[PDB]
Structure formats: C-alpha cells, structure tokens
RNA sequence: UUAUCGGCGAGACCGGGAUGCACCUCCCGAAGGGUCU
C-alpha cells in the first residue's frame, strides 16, 4: 500500500538502456510472474498474470523470489 | 503493485561556583635651504 501506508516511497528515478531484454526471462529464470507452462523455473504461486493483481481468476504461475537483492554496481552494468 | 481500513500519543527548566592575573620608557640623529623694485 503506497497509497494508504506510503510504503516504498521512491525518488531519483533513473532509467538506463539495457542490451538484453531481462524483463520476463533470465537464463531460464523468470524475473516476474509468468504462467507455469512457459517453462521458466522459480517459485510456484497463484496470481493473475496481468495487473491489477487483485482482480481476475488467480491461475497457477511461476514467480521469482519475493526478495531479490543485487549489487547496485552490477545493476548499473547493463 | 496480490488489495481496500489505522496520526502512536501524551510530562518534564538540568541547574547549581569561580576576578585569570601577575613586569616591561622603544628610544636612539639631522638647519630644507636659495632666486628675482
């Protein structure tokens, strides 16, 4: 709840171009909720694929670890 | 944004004492002079 609780306020939004599309897949590891049949491994769950994630039938999905950490230097490498 | 919603709050004196002072001469030398009812 960013709206109600003001959790996870952010600023200084910086966008940088990437070289490889790392939105859905990452060497076969899903980086976001994807259907089970997509062949991507990770953690099983139930959720709608498309937002908003509180409406729509909750179908089986594979999603990454809820808390993923990466070094900022590695993230800025691109 | 995996839901929907939620002020953390209320009260307090921090203050009470102290001399910083005690000793030193800054002086030593020179002509500013000469030209035009």
Any idea what DSSP says for residue A7? T
Asked whether the beta carbons of A26 and A20 are under 8 A apart, the reply is no
- Which nucleotide's C1' is closest to A52 (Cα)? B1
CA proximity to A46, closest of A27, A28, A60, A66: A60
| CB of A65 closer than 8 Å to CB of A43 | yes
- Which of A17, A35, A10, A5 is CA-nearest to residue A76? A17
Q: For residue A34, what are the β-bridge partners? A: A62
- Check whether residue A33 has its CB closer than 7 Å to nucleic acid strand B: yes
Nucleic acid strand B: bases within 7 A of protein CB = 1-6
Technique of determination: cryo-EM
Q: How is A8-71 classified by DSSP, letter by letter?
A: T----------SS--SS-STTB-SS-EEGGG--BSEEEEE-SSSPTTSS--EEEEE--SS----
Retrieve residue A40's tokens.
């991507």
């Amino acid at each position: 709840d960013y709206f109600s609780a003001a959790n996870g306020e952010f600023n200084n939004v910086t966008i940088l171009p990437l070289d490889i599309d790392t939105s859905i897949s990452n060497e076969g590891m899903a980086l976001r909720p994807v259907p089970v049949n997509s062949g991507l491994n990770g953690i099983k769950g139930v959720s709608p694929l498309i937002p908003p994630y509180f409406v729509g039938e909750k179908l089986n999905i594979v999603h990454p670890a809820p808390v993923r950490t990466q070094l900022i230097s590695s993230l800025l490498r691109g």
